[PDB]
Design a protein around this ligand. Structure first.
Ligand SMILES: CCCCCCCCCCCCCCCCCC(=O)OC[C@H](CO[C@@H]1O[C@H](CO)[C@H](O)[C@H](O)[C@H]1O)OC(=O)CCCCCCCCCCCCCCCCC
Ligand SMILES: CCCCCCCCCCCCCCCCCC(=O)O[C@@H](COC(=O)CCCCCCCCCCCCCCC)COP(=O)(O)OC[C@H](O)CO
Ligand SMILES: CCCCCCCCCCCCCCCCCC(=O)O[C@@H](COC(=O)CCCCCCCCCCCCCCC)COP(=O)(O)OC[C@H](O)CO
Ligand SMILES: CCCCCCCCCCCCCCCCCC(=O)O[C@@H](COC(=O)CCCCCCCCCCCCCCC)COP(=O)(O)OC[C@H](O)CO
Ligand SMILES: CCCCCCCCCCCCCCCCCC(=O)O[C@@H](COC(=O)CCCCCCCCCCCCCCC)COP(=O)(O)OC[C@H](O)CO
Ligand SMILES: CC(C)=CCC/C(C)=C/CC/C(C)=C/CC/C(C)=C/CC/C(C)=C/CC/C(C)=C/CC/C(C)=C/CC1=CC(=O)C(C)=C(C)C1=O
Ligand code: SF4
Ligand code: SF4
Ligand code: SF4
Lengths: 50, 202, 150, 141, 165, 54, 115, 371, 163, 158
């Protein structure tokens, strides 16, 4: 990464803000609640180790 | 005369600090992280591979290839789209989340190229299937030309406002009737080379 | 225990060669296939946070943590570093911890881009037939050596 | 004079609480549909209010014209396209539900749409996401 | 050179009022931008905020912009040997877009990308276009630079002596 | 960089590292070189270049 | 207290995904469509909904893992009290480790850990 | 266990491991491949139909679009079909240039096989490592022919133009650098334990099965069969150079990998020998070289079959003329299209993650499988 | 029985050695200079026979239409009329659409008057497809050489070897 | 002149017809479709290990459909292998040719191509279906009198 910031420093910040501004897509065939709960549980249980 | 017409719309918004700078920062963030679909069909994908490699780097613009459509912003259509592939291409484009951008790379993706004259299955341009933002001429376009097309796409992306969002959602009109056709099961059922030795039938 | 902890933490962080649930070449994106927007970012953060916490636990459990001194040798630099106390001592400890964490951040980031990835059956074989008996033997050796302390 | 386009294409009665369903194991793996930038013919029941598509209802053909708006559509033009679609479906009676038949139907429907555009019935939609004129640039006669 | 060169080329600068004043005073503006692009939208965005509608014109395939933009022009669609040669006539692009704009629009802005490929006289006409059409603003990328800088297009085309900045 | 990134994340938006023009006379993008021969054109790359060609 | 920080940290860690979801909901647009909501199956139209039904002989390591988790949980308090007490707890936990080893050997020889 | 337990997954046109738009309908019983059905034709542009109603000087750009990695082999077969029909001789310098270009294209094709193969195994760095030198091959081709790919360099009764000044030394320096690069590749990959354990015992093919299935090239040569069409048919000048047919006894994917590495080395030896003994004289045939209306090559009224040893196997052209500029029939025998049909037999009773290894072992690109 | 453990030992150390060998081979590339061409701040100088955008000379065209026949798709459009005073073909319009062009080089090779040439002008991307229909004025524009752009570093692929 | 394979067949009393040689002198024989399934096994018995290519072509529009087989031997120690071309002709109204998939497996895909492009139906082929064209397609594209039915996405990009 060279162009997102001086030496690509702002590349990951750009990725995060893009994912923030990206449309939240839910599956029609599956279950919404498990879909929303899964990654939250993973990130909570990983953050709790700090 | 195939004329053009502007529909009726309201005044935009007007803002001082919050909305304008938020929109500018959102545009800048979507500039530097245009993740391609890793959609490859034909020979042009090789040059696409040459833009993933070391001599011309995808990573300088961001532009990390993501396999799943849900994680892809840009679809960079490389290759001829046959009749057998075009519905799959349109699904893949539709499954990508908004906002999404299309670059038609290669002469076969703009107008059909060499196959525009005698091929009985080549779709003459994906503009008949997907809305294309930037057209990239050339049979195997040089990877620098691909970067130039991506630069022009960034030039158009940075010009976006919030109003363009309501230009992007589909109108979603439908019409349903009975067809009285003949319903038949799929020919390709997945049964292949299983109990083949008992299929002689002399 | 150091090697087995490295391999087990790399498997739990799902870094290559243990990237099987998210293996892009076998499945399109794994469990992240249908995930778009902020949730994919969450499942990305969580992965990198797991990598960071694994590196921190490597430098805490097996390396010396914030400690950097050689009491058995007349190392002037290390003695002068350990002689500092207060705000500056805590700052130097944070610096040392971050450097030791960055070593075992550099190693797995390289590991992803160097080795090929494992297979599911071979992953199970490595986990259950090469790492577990070896860890049991390491625990037995640790207990036998700790018998001398009491 | 008169009313004109008096056919007034009658859709099937609207269902309620329709939930999205995938195709079955035996019927899956096939397209049973014709999708293209201006026309989507699906052998499914798609409702527009909740965006739910039931693909197990293979006895219904759902037609979606111009999802990414490139033309400005009035209700009369929609009715014209819909009566043409009904006539085309009734014309192909006895044909299989394969992708080939639906692609042919979509091809004639898009030829009709291009004829309407060049006759002045519809105009290109400005304030669209793109301006590429897939049916041809503005030209004079 | 350094110091100022290596100091912030950030996109939060207060040059925007000067940019709008220049684009209102000097109707035709030559613009120079970063090579990787994307730092032009901050300046075109505020023009689009005032009601201006953009017409994107590529200068490579422009083809004698006088009759391409301000006149009805003949173009031949590409036959591939299956059709006889047909001569189509296209409406004047900028005037068609002008007469087809909504009444509330402030005007039309012609964004001429890759204007370096045009000759001197083509740039002269592109600079003098707003004199003929009052409600048209001309923006032409005449090159690339480390930072966004704009000049009057008449100065670049040679109608006005190039004053030192 | 890993240690001091909280301090680099502030300075990075207020710094640009864009590469400079080949001639050290181009004050403006519309400026013309005095003599277009003293520039060095044809920088090589890794198989056949040294550190002087960057 | 050493555990109110734990509760506050847990509350903050649970709040963070809620904040991310709320920010995405108020920032990202919605443009839902019937083609977009279809399940992704590499372009082709998915057949019957998911579902694999693995073999038992593959997933027989989980029954070993349930027992081994309990054994490794039971080994921790002995290690915490290894220094306060002496060789008595060494003899006590030696049988535990030996039974663990014998169970691992049985699972290895019977083919439970084979794929 | 017949149904509702067997998962039918369409690992289809859009898949990173699927080279191009190959589709596999794979039936899995808990990560075990019961069987797989290959669906191809997502890139079928009808090139055999476009082969008619096109002259040879018009059809030559179309030729490089099958096997776009090894373009010179397709160009060679297209220009040596009709020149054999018309009994056109090729000058020795043109033949040597053709041999050099064919061997360079074989090197490039083996490289850009090794890349996606190791990517499918799991290593992404070798892709960039091969691209570092395939860019040098592209530079040589663009210096000589004028483009990186789709060269349009081969012509009937010769070549388009002579080699530019300063090309021999550049190619020799490339060979010297590429030998070192190949040694680095073999040091990094060949004995790696993960690579071996992913590759060592997958896709065992018997020699008799390889012969019956119609396999050719590194697929057939990796089953104990020393069958190379360069030494059997005495193509061009391959009888003058010292080289060895690379074949291995075991049938697994490791044998195919070793065969392709050895073929790259032998190819480099062939470029070195050819450049050391390059002849002089003309390159275009002066007999055929002759505002006025220009006719194309009128094919004679007889059938013909011509073969070439492509890096993927045997590439063939069956040509039926009609005493006119447009050929009556132009059938393409693609090596990948015939090598692909053994895949369901190999992946049967294997595992899901082994499909990538098996498919990367076979040099399949989808632009040549369909036409 | 002991020999099995010994063989397990020697077949484990070998794997560790080869993993370290892969690590060393990969990390030895950190001491080597990058090969990346930093487009668009750096541009690679094209070859002497690179096939790019067509350049057309209007005065040298005779409307003989052999460039159309030599094209694989008959792409070039040559609208001409006969000047009855001299009975020579007068050219009215010449157009090549670069959305269908494949840059094969047949037109520039089989043109008898040699009015068609290949330039180095790649990067012809446009936002609109129909803007790629270059007429005789757009084709007649001189290409912009990257050696004349002094804000970039022109990269040469190989040493000039002209000595 | 009589070829080696033709002389062997007339020695073994197998009906056929010699159509001559190509430009390389490879023998070309014509086999009746009713005898082709019995003659293919005898061809392998002769020693033709390798089915190099299977092809189909149109003799004339509105005329016969010809299916072409190229055969050779792969063996150790043979300098010049023996190659033979063999053509089986079927009527256009209902083309039926026995499949050699049970003799050489290499025909497995190739005959399907001959079914997909020209419509020649192969009897004992166990998986005879369209391979290159879409599976729901109606018509055989490579026949000389085929006409494309005016699909929208095949027409000119307007
Ligand atoms: C940082 C560490 C990076 C390397 C760890 C990756 C996993 C690994 O070593 O698997 C790579 C191989 C996989 O090795 C396989 O699994 C078992 C391991 O003993 C058995 O040996 C199997 O027979 C062998 O094939 O692991 C080893 O051989 C041990 C190497 C130890 C390196 C330390
Ligand atoms: C005040 C906050 C906004 C700000 O600082 O803007 C920058 C940061 O804002 C953002 O883009 C969003 C991230 C927030 C931090 C954008 O500039 P840049 O770093 O992208 O450009 C500088 C130079 O030309 C290239 O390095
Ligand atoms: C990078 C940032 C700088 C490095 C880290 C700074 C903080 C690390 C040193 C202090 C914490 C670890 C040592 C604990 C003992 C100590 O010195 O604690 C101080 C903790 O200091 C702080 O409160 C934090 C200082 C500000 C934080 C940084 C700015 C004392 O201040 P106090 O408020 O507890 O008492 C002062 C007075 O007598 C009233 O009680
Ligand atoms: C301190 C570390 C102490 C443990 C040493 C490392 C772990 C054992 C090394 C040997 C090993 O990994 O075994 C191999 C080599 O092992 C052999 O000697 C092969 C014969 C295996 C016989 C049946 C399994 C019993 C093995 C018991 C090993 C020790 C058990 C744990 C002891 C703590 C692989 O055998 P397999 O599981 O593939 O064998 C099964 C196969 O079907 C053959 O029967
Ligand atoms: C599994 C973990 C990774 C293992 C392999 C790591 C990679 C090893 C290094 C491979 C590249 C060698 C580059 C040679 C550089 C030549 C110039 C130089 O400085 O050479 C010195 C090599 O300098 C280095 O130390 C190289 C940098 C290694 C540290 C960076 C990698 C960390 C992982 C020579 O000293 P030495 O070999 O005795 O040094 C090593 C010794 O242990 C010092 O006491
Ligand atoms: C700063 C804190 C404030 C003040 C707000 C928080 C902002 C924040 C830090 C937001 C989320 C940022 C992460 C942190 C955003 C997502 C980053 C991942 C984490 C992004 C995924 C990008 C890949 C897409 C990254 C790795 C990646 C690199 C690569 O080269 C290849 C080939 C592949 C296949 C990869 O996956
Ligand atoms: S431009 Fe078209 S024909 Fe040429 S390689 Fe690309 S996809 Fe194939
Ligand atoms: S071949 Fe040359 S002279 Fe003849 S019509 Fe074409 S461009 Fe004109
Ligand atoms: S370059 Fe080739 S494709 Fe393009 S116009 Fe000329 S002959 Fe036609």
């Amino acid at each position: 990464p060279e162009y997102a910031g001086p030496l690509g420093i702002l590349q990951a910040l750009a990725d995060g803000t893009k994912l923030l501004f990206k449309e939240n897509l839910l599956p029609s065939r599956g279950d919404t609640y498990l879909f929303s709960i899964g990654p939250s549980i993973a990130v909570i249980s990983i953050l709790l180790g700090y | 005369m195939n004329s053009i017409e502007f529909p009726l719309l309201d005044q935009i918004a007007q803002n001082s600090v919050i909305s304008t700078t938020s929109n500018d920062l959102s545009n800048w963030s979507r500039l530097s992280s245009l993740w391609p679909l890793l959609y490859g069909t034909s020979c042009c994908f090789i040059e696409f591979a040459s833009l993933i490699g070391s001599r011309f780097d995808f990573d300088r613009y961001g532009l990390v290839p993501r396999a799943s459509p849900r994680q892809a912003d840009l679809i960079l259509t490389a290759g001829t789209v046959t009749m057998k592939m075009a519905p799959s291409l349109l699904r893949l484009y539709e499954q990508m989340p908004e906002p999404k951008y299309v670059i038609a790379m290669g002469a076969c993706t703009i107008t059909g190229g060499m196959f525009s004259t005698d091929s009985y299955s080549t779709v003459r341009g994906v503009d008949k299937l997907i809305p294309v933002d930037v057209y990239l001429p050339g049979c195997p376009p040089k990877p620098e030309a691909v970067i130039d097309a991506i630069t022009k796409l960034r030039k158009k992306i940075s010009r976006e406002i919030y109003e363009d969002r309501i230009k992007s959602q589909p109108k979603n009109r439908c019409f349903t009737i009975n067809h009285k056709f003949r319903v038949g099961r799929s020919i390709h059922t997945g049964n292949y080379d299983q109990a083949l030795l008992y299929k002689y039938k002399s | 225990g150091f090697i087995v902890f490295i391999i087990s933490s790399l498997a739990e962080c799902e870094r290559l060669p243990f990237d099987l649930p998210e293996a892009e070449e076998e499945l399109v994106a794994g469990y992240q296939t249908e995930y778009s927007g902020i949730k994919f970012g969450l499942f990305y953060v969580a992965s990198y946070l797991n990598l960071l916490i694994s590196s921190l636990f490597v430098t805490v459990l097996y390396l010396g943590g914030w400690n950097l001194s050689i009491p058995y040798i007349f190392i002037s630099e290390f003695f002068e570093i350990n002689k500092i106390d207060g705000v500056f001592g805590t700052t130097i400890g944070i610096f040392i911890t971050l450097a030791k964490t960055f070593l075992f951040l550099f190693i797995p980031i390289t590991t992803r881009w160097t080795l090929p990835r494992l297979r599911m059956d071979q992953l199970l074989n490595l986990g259950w037939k090469f790492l577990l008996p070896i860890s049991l033997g390491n625990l037995l050796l640790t207990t036998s050596s700790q018998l001398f302390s009491l | 004079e008169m009313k004109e386009v008096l056919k007034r294409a009658t859709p099937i009665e609207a269902q309620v609480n329709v939930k999205s369903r995938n195709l079955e194991r035996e019927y899956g793996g096939q397209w049973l549909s014709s999708v293209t930038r201006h026309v989507r013919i699906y052998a499914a029941y798609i409702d527009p209010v909740t965006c739910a598509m039931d693909q197990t209802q293979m006895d219904k053909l759902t037609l979606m014209i111009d999802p990414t708006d490139e033309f400005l559509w009035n209700d009369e033009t929609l009715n014209k396209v819909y009566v043409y679609f009904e006539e085309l479906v009734d014309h192909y009676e006895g044909a299989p539900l394969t992708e080939y038949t639906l692609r042919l139907i979509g091809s004639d429907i898009e030829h009709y749409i291009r004829k309407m555009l060049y006759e002045g019935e519809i105009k290109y939609n400005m304030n669209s996401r793109v301006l590429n004129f897939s049916m041809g640039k503005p030209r004079m006669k | 050179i350094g110091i100022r060169d290596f100091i912030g080329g950030d996109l939060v600068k207060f040059d925007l009022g000067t940019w709008l004043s220049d684009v209102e005073e000097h109707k035709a503006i030559a613009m120079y931008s970063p090579h990787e692009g994307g730092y032009e939208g901050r300046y075109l965005n505020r023009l689009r905020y005032q009601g201006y509608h953009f017409l994107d014109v590529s200068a490579r395939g422009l083809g004698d912009p006088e009759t391409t933009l301000t006149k009805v022009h003949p173009v031949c669609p590409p036959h591939v040997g299956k059709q006889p040669i047909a001569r189509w006539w296209f409406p004047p692009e900028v005037d068609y877009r002008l007469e087809a704009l909504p009444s509330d629009a402030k005007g039309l802005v012609v964004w001429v990308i890759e204007a370096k490929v045009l000759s001197k006289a083509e740039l002269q006409f592109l600079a003098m276009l707003p004199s003929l059409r009052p409600k048209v603003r001309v923006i032409a990328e005449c090159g690339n630079w480390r930072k966004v800088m704009w000049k009057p297009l008449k100065e670049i085309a040679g109608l006005v002596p190039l004053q030192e900045a | 960089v890993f240690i001091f990134f909280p301090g680099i994340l502030v300075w990075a938006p207020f710094l640009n590292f864009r590469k400079f023009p080949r001639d050290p006379t181009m004050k403006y993008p519309w400026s013309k070189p005095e003599n277009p021969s003293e520039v060095k054109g044809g920088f090589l790359k890794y198989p056949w270049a040294t550190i002087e060609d960057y | 207290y050493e555990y109110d920080i734990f509760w506050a940290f847990l509350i903050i860690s649970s709040v963070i995904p809620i904040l991310a979801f709320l920010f995405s909901g108020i920032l990202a647009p919605i443009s839902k469509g019937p083609e977009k909501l279809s399940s992704y199956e590499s372009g082709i139209e998915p057949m019957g909904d998911a579902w694999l039904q693995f073999r038992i002989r593959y997933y027989m390591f989980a029954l070993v893992f349930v027992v081994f988790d309990v054994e490794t949980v039971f080994l921790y308090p002995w290690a915490m009290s290894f220094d306060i007490l002496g060789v008595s707890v060494f003899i006590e936990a030696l049988i535990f480790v030996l039974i663990l080893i014998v169970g691992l050997v049985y699972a290895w020889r019977k083919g439970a850990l084979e794929w | 266990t017949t149904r509702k337990d067997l998962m039918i997954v369409n690992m289809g046109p859009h898949h990173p491991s699927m080279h191009g738009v190959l589709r596999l309908i794979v039936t899995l019983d808990g990560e075990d491949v019961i069987d797989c059905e290959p669906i191809v034709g997502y890139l079928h542009r009808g090139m055999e139909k476009i082969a008619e109603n096109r002259t040879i000087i018009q059809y030559l750009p179309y030729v490089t679009r099958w096997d776009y990695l090894a373009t010179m082999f397709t160009e060679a077969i297209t220009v040596n079909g009709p020149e054999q029909l018309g009994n056109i001789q090729v000058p020795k310098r043109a033949s040597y240039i053709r041999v050099i270009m064919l061997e360079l294209s074989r090197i490039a094709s083996h490289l850009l096989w090794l890349g996606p193969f190791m990517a499918d195994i799991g290593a992404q760095t070798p892709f960039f490592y091969i691209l570092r030198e395939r860019e040098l091959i592209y530079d040589l081709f663009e210096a000589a022919t004028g483009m990186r790919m789709m060269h349009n360099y081969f012509r009937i009764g010769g070549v388009a133009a002579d080699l530019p000044y300063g090309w021999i030394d550049k190619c020799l320096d490339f060979c010297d650098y590429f030998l070192i690069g190949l040694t680095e590749y073999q040091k990094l990959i060949t004995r790696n334990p993960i690579f071996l354990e992913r590759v060592e015992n997958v896709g065992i093919i018997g020699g008799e099965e390889a012969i019956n299935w119609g396999l050719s090239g590194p697929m057939l040569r990796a089953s104990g069969i020393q069958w190379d069409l360069r030494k059997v048919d005495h193509y061009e000048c391959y009888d003058e150079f010292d080289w060895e047919v690379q074949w291995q006894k075991e049938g697994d994917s490791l044998a195919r990998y070793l065969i392709r590495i050895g073929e790259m080395a032998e190819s480099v030896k062939i470029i070195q020998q050819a450049l050391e003994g390059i002849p002089g004289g003309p390159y275009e045939n002066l007999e055929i070289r002759r505002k006025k209306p220009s006719p194309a090559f009128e094919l004679s009224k007889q059938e013909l079959y011509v073969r070439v040893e492509a890096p993927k196997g045997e590439l063939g052209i069956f040509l039926i003329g009609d005493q006119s500029v447009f050929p009556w029939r132009w059938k393409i025998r693609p090596p990948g299209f015939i090598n692909l049909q053994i895949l369901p037999q190999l992946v049967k009773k294997m595992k899901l993650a082994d499909i990538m290894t098996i498919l990367g072992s076979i040099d399949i690109i989808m632009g040549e499988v369909d036409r | 029985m002991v020999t099995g453990f010994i063989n397990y030992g020697q077949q484990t150390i070998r794997a560790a050695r080869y993993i370290g060998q892969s690590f060393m081979i990969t990390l030895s590339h950190a001491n080597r200079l990058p090969v990346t061409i930093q487009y668009p701040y750096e541009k690679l100088i094209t070859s002497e026979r690179f096939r790019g955008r067509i350049h057309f000379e209007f005065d040298k065209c005779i409307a003989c239409e052999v460039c159309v026949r030599a094209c694989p798709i008959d792409l070039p459009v040559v609208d001409w009329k006969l000047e009855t005073d001299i009975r020579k073909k007068r050219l009215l319009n010449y157009s090549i659409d670069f959305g269908i062009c494949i840059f094969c080089g047949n037109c520039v090779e089989y043109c008898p008057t040699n009015c068609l040439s290949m330039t180095e002008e790649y990067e012809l991307s446009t936002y609109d497809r129909h803007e790629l229909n270059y007429n005789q004025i757009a084709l007649g524009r001189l290409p912009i050489s990257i050696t004349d752009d002094y804000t970039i570093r022109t990269i040469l692929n190989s040493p000039q070897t002209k000595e | 002149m009589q070829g080696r394979l033709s002389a062997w067949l007339v020695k073994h009393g197998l009906v056929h017809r010699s159509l001559g040689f190509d430009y390389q002198g490879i023998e070309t024989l014509q086999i009746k479709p009713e005898d082709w399934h019995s003659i293919a096994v005898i061809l392998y018995v002769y020693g033709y290990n390798y089915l190099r290519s299977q092809c189909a072509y149109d003799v004339a529009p509105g005329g016969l459909l010809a299916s072409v087989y190229h055969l050779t031997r792969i063996e150790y120690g043979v300098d010049q292998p023996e190659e033979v071309c063999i053509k089986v002709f079927a009527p256009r109204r209902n083309p039926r040719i026995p499949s050699v998939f049970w003799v050489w497996k290499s025909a497995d895909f190739q005959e399907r191509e001959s079914y997909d492009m020209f419509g020649i139906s192969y009897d004992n082929h166990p998986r005879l279906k369209r391979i290159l064209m879409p599976e729901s397609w109606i018509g055989w594209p490579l026949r000389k009198d085929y006409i494309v039915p005016n699909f929208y996405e095949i027409q000119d990009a307007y």
